[model samples]
Target: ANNLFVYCEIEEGIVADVSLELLTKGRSLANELNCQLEAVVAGTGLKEIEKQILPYGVDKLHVFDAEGLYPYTSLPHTSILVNLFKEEQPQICLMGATVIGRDLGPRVSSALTSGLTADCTSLEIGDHEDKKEGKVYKNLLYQIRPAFGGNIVATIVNPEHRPQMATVREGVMKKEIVSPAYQGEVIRHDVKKYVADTDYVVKVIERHVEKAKN
Candidate 1:
């Protein structure tokens, strides 16, 4: 299958929601590539589970379940994704430019020895595959970001890596619900085995819950 994996962000059992927009753009790309668009979601308990993003065009939702992964630490996240991609390589990898993604993408990429292009405004399939010296597939990831204070458009690429990765900011892409039929295969992954013992907080101190009041 053509691998177009999207990293979904979740917090407090609720999804970040910005990831839905990222998948919206990912949908067209998946269609163009004639591949399955899967969401790589990792979080504690059922927090990694959601159907909201499926409506926006998600083909597969891979869940990495664990209790220690609730608060979003760098180690566990990088470990989970690194393993997943190592096992199942994706053609295109996308994530939100949120705090967690920014933190995780680089670490995971380095761990896998792959290139990661951050803050990409646009993502397209590379034209050249064989990097014959001068023309190295523009594989530098085409890290398209607003240049000169959001005045000029820039094209960036990581020519030296596999599984091209990019992070899109919130609201930069369009999102809409199509149907529940868009739901893809739900894969449950075991991430606990690979997590490392760190000095990070393992228990919830206090969660401030907000409610709609009258």
Candidate 2:
């Protein structure tokens, strides 16, 4: 686990604002750690997705496009992240705190036993002083969020974990685009390698969204 990665979620051929927001935040974190910023996206009709992602100053972009990737099934996406994370071994992983994230984050965490923090309002990187153990740590992800019905705020940290993961809610972080001319390597991954056919057991056959009553 050396570099930082952000999972970019897509919808209808467009990258979601929350995903871009996390990428923006990830870029900052990467720079703070003096490491490269990486990204991964899985969906259909994502041929031009790199246009939206690379401008955020990503050093590498991994794309996984397939027939059943759209509309977001559970197993396929979970397998993709779990397998990819195992191979790449990113130090920190960030994602959006939406329905897909809420469902997928825990699965990936459970699969890798890497642990995850959900709905983090903010993320910061700094040193930590372990007074009890008389040790000093560097470059820890401060996963900040509210807890206990908003009565208290919690800052969670992983002292000894490979990928310290967290999910930030949409609109929690501003989506700022970097230089449009910024170059990054685009890698179109073989979906079959990271995701197995058996993982497609739980396919999303249908989806329905009802309008709000308010």
RMSD, one per candidate, in order? 9.2, 7.7
How would you encode candidate 1's per-residue C-alpha lDDT over 90-202 as one tens digit per residue?
86788999999889988988887877767778776545455456454532334577777888987666565667788888878877766776656777776766666677576
Find the 10 residues in a row with the least total lDDT in model 1.
Answer: 134-143
TM-score of each: 0.80, 0.89
Error of 1 at 100 (Å): 1.0
Q: Show where candidate 2 strays beyond 4 Å.
A: 199-214
Clashes of each: 12, 0
| lDDT of model 1, residue 12 | 74
Q: Candidate 2 — what's its lDDT?
A: 0.90
Question: In candidate 2, what are the lDDT values of residues 1-214, reduced to their tens digit?
Answer: 3899999988888889999999999999999999999999999878888999999999999999998888898888999999988988988999999999999999998888986999898899977889999998899999999988999998888877868999999899998878998799999998988886653366654434555566
lDDT of each: 0.76, 0.90
